[PDB]
Design a protein around this ligand. Structure first.
Ligand code: HEM
Ligand code: HEM
Ligand code: HEM
Ligand code: HEM
Ligand code: HEM
Ligand code: HEM
Lengths: 179, 179, 179, 179, 179, 179
């Protein structure tokens, strides 16, 4: 069983996070550069998710949602939900998003899941302090991850520009109006 | 039979209109916030239509066209035409867009259709003067609408930003190049 | 056999090119205005391609790639590759992109292919000097094109604005993650 | 208001019906030959619908469902439900299917709807007796249809063969397993 | 670790198998009746798979493939592979198909997988002898399955008719010709 | 220029033809076995086309149409037309189908096209007499084909069974009802 943070400040968790390192999900592009997530609090309390990465020089992105697995619990156990393929978004896919650690200043976080398949180390700065990085990697070991093949995500000196306003660019609203 | 405005100044009707209230079409998201339309005059005299709304914090939009149902008539009876689903835009859908009323300054308008199914009250300002709102609602009653369940569309204090340049973002041009 | 330029400076060829005139490909919209291409050098040495045109007042675009047909050759024989339809990008299509001529200052170019089906005259300025235009048309005749029905692409006095950062807006990354 | 038959014997209504004449729905092929419906009672009491027609020599078909609009009512007011397009069956469409008349022997029937848009005269025999045909046309007039442009559906001397076992050939089961 | 049968006679395993009971996969319809699989040996030694079930009176099916996870091994560890959705078969999905037990006469079999998620008891007869059924359920317990909620698949007295010749009815051949 | 047969007896050309050998089109499966075409005369004089082949033990097929390139000409220059992909048949593709030779008894034929890209030798019998085969190959050489890599299509001793009644199994009728 995993130790997930309790009492996450959702408002404060919003904004931009850079992926410092990750065991990417199956469909997350594997040799991404400048990978980042933008989180926005929706009016109903769920979270809008914009994940972005640069694959061989081109921005790719996916829009989705995150929400509490059990609203009555104080554990930071979320689910993320996407509609795929992006160009025909009719298949809902979900997965576990557990905040294993976050510092008091909400500057870096360790994201994991009970399967120990995937893992992300996030930072408000694209260039993370090295001792802090090692501490979060060690925290992943405490939770039973094998961090042997964990490689850092390349981050440019300056972050590339993009539109990160919350949007449904693929038209999921139309598919949902059907039902 | 409905009294539609005659001799609409199409050039002057272009630009941004906020939806103050509406009996939304079946696929227009029902609890939209900050709903607006942007109209642009195309070189061939048809109208490019960008409708936008914010559903639970996310921008959703559709691009389409409007044109005169009978070009030889001076009645403001338009058709709107969209290709749906937005993510596979192969089905053309059309409907009636009748300007039932517009003021001399082109600042607010009542849009309806002979089926009396759907209705929109539009304004150049997101915050419409209350007596003017009541007058346009009364004009809808004169045309036989039941305005009992008509609710105002929530509008933020400041309008959210978006790209409203005229675009074919889903690739309808490719589908039309086929034929 | 065609005389293709040798030793193209790929870095220098990048950036924005306006289409002055063209025998458009089958799916390139035929009565385009303000047609332009933006080329960006990818980290792996291939070229990101953004082609844009305005069809009846609306921006339409396609994102693709260009690369050397034979990397060991010094001939500017490229292939362009797109995934179509844009709204369901599962079909890879390729074609020949041969730089038949470019001036020492990289200010205008003649693009063709051995089939003599399609042809593009490109310029860093949307308004090309008339004697230079005639010279490139004559160069196409030297390569066996019939330039009788070649019409110039209309270009506005000022170029319309668009986002030309390199992007995969349709989600090809997801389709490629599958394989 | 329409006079719909009461107390329809659903079991007895099952089987094959030939379309003798019809004001076809928008997507029902318009110059069909040998048009027929096959109805089968499903275990849950709904009706499986297979409609077939021959368009220029080729069998086309659609599979769908019919069920009672109000189960507590004894009026033969059904809804039919299809998932379209057949090759991407993600859009549910429904419409009214009202049995306006059926003879005691369940040998011919008049199908209509309150919109008076569409109409079908059905027969267990592809070759319907002429006086019986005229009587059912007159029954449609009693319900307010304009039968002026009603043309008989061509029926061959012998009915073409097809597989009419109840099937989900397009894979709707997979789309429904998602939800 | 699971005890899988060794030295399966693939030729002899071919033909029709009825599903007597199952913990159905996520997309296998859950309240199926008359569920069966037909296996055919392909020229290259892989196995063509046709799974069929009747959901509320309608035949639904999927075509796929099975093959050896490790050809050099004598363990009956197969993978099954399908392209989904059936109506747009562009997503390859695979899963484990392990023959946990088969009797010397190839008349009944227990199919499972190391995840212990899904389970099938198969029989050449739709009506399986009760003591034999209990023995195979016990064999599943030996492999660590919780058989508490295992319900038998309803099987009609006579099997429904269908076309079980090996076919690619959805056009996967076209998608594969692309690559 | 090619010598195409004049005055083809279309009625007599209908029925089943086995492909004895072929330079397959790009999307025709390349290692097909038991490849055959079935042609049926439609009421409007066009030809329904069912092509079938067995790829690694599974039937794959495509339905399309053939018609006269110039109805006023007596040359057997046809076009074939298909809608692809079969599972989303929205793209019309056409190509040339020229009968280069047919014997007086309508028992074997040579099909080609001016591009000399593709070629088919057809026979009413799956097992073609060897001297007749050589004569038709020589006829292809007379028309400028390089027959060096031409391999015979494997044909079983007995032809596999299939449904060859004329059908629109993918629902093209629905896509065409739209327009
Ligand atoms: C800060 C960076 C990211 C974080 C923290 C993150 C987190 C997650 C998590 C927890 C899941 C659930 C995985 C599972 O258990 O199935 C997931 C799935 C997914 N992610 Fe990411 N992700 C990130 C970046 C990205 C990027 C850059 C992309 C693509 C542009 C992406 C695309 C996807 C997709 C498509 C899925 C669903 C895959 C499926 O259907 O199984 N993610 N992500
Ligand atoms: C000023 C606001 C709007 C106006 C005046 C307006 C007007 C109309 C009209 C007159 C129709 C034809 C309806 C019919 O008779 O079938 C229509 C249809 C449609 N509208 Fe809107 N609309 C607005 C906002 C929106 C928004 C925000 C969306 C979605 C983002 C939207 C999506 C659609 C769609 C998808 C259809 C076609 C539905 C169908 O296929 O039946 N509209 N609109
Ligand atoms: C500077 C302007 C352009 C240049 C130099 C250019 C060049 C090319 C070339 C060389 C090809 C290969 C053609 C072949 O042999 O099959 C091609 C194909 C294609 N182009 Fe363009 N192009 C331009 C503008 C555009 C624009 C504005 C569009 C649409 C927005 C477009 C859409 C396409 C598509 C969809 C294909 C693939 C068509 C197919 O599948 O056959 N192009 N282009
Ligand atoms: C005995 C013959 C038939 C009967 C009684 C019948 C009846 C109906 C009815 C009552 C509707 C609802 C229409 C509405 O109000 O929207 C409908 C819709 C439909 N029918 Fe038929 N039909 C027949 C034949 C066919 C055939 C041969 C086809 C095509 C092969 C077909 C395809 C459709 C489709 C696709 C729809 C839905 C259209 C939409 O989305 O609006 N029907 N049919
Ligand atoms: C004798 C009966 C059956 C057997 C032994 C069987 C076996 C299997 C197995 C071993 C898997 C891999 C599951 C995994 O680990 O992901 C699978 C997946 C699947 N089965 Fe079945 N199956 C049967 C019946 C059916 C039927 C009747 C259907 C639908 C008509 C069906 C549809 C599917 C689909 C769509 C998948 C892939 C699901 C996914 O993408 O995860 N199966 N089957
Ligand atoms: C007697 C056997 C066959 C004959 C005579 C034949 C003939 C032709 C011809 C003349 C074309 C036009 C090619 C072009 O110039 O683009 C064509 C295209 C095509 N054929 Fe065949 N064919 C046969 C078998 C098949 C089979 C077995 C299949 C697949 C099951 C098939 C699938 C296709 C497809 C998909 C196209 C269109 C490809 C494209 O979009 O370019 N054909 N066929």
């Amino acid at each position: 069983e995993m130790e997930v943070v309790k009492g996450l400040n959702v408002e404060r968790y919003m904004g931009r996070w850079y992926e410092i390192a990750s065991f990417p999900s199956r469909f997350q592009p594997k040799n991404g550069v400048d990978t980042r997530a933008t989180y926005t609090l929706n009016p109903d309390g769920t979270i809008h998710v914009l994940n972005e990465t640069w694959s061989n020089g081109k921005r790719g992105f996916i829009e989705g949602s995150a929400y509490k697995a059990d609203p009555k619990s104080d554990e930071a156990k979320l689910k993320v939900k996407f509609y795929v393929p992006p160009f025909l978004p009719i298949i809902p896919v979900t997965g576990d998003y557990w905040v294993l650690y976050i510092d008091p200043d909400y500057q870096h976080a360790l994201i994991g899941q009970p399967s120990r398949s995937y893992l992300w180390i996030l930072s408000r700065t694209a260039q993370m302090e090295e001792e802090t990085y090692k501490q979060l990697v060690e925290k992943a070991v405490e939770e039973g991850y094998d961090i042997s093949k964990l490689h850092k995500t390349p981050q440019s000196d300056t972050p590339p520009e993009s539109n990160t306003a919350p949007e449904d660019s693929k038209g999921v609203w139309w598919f949902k109006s059907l039902f």
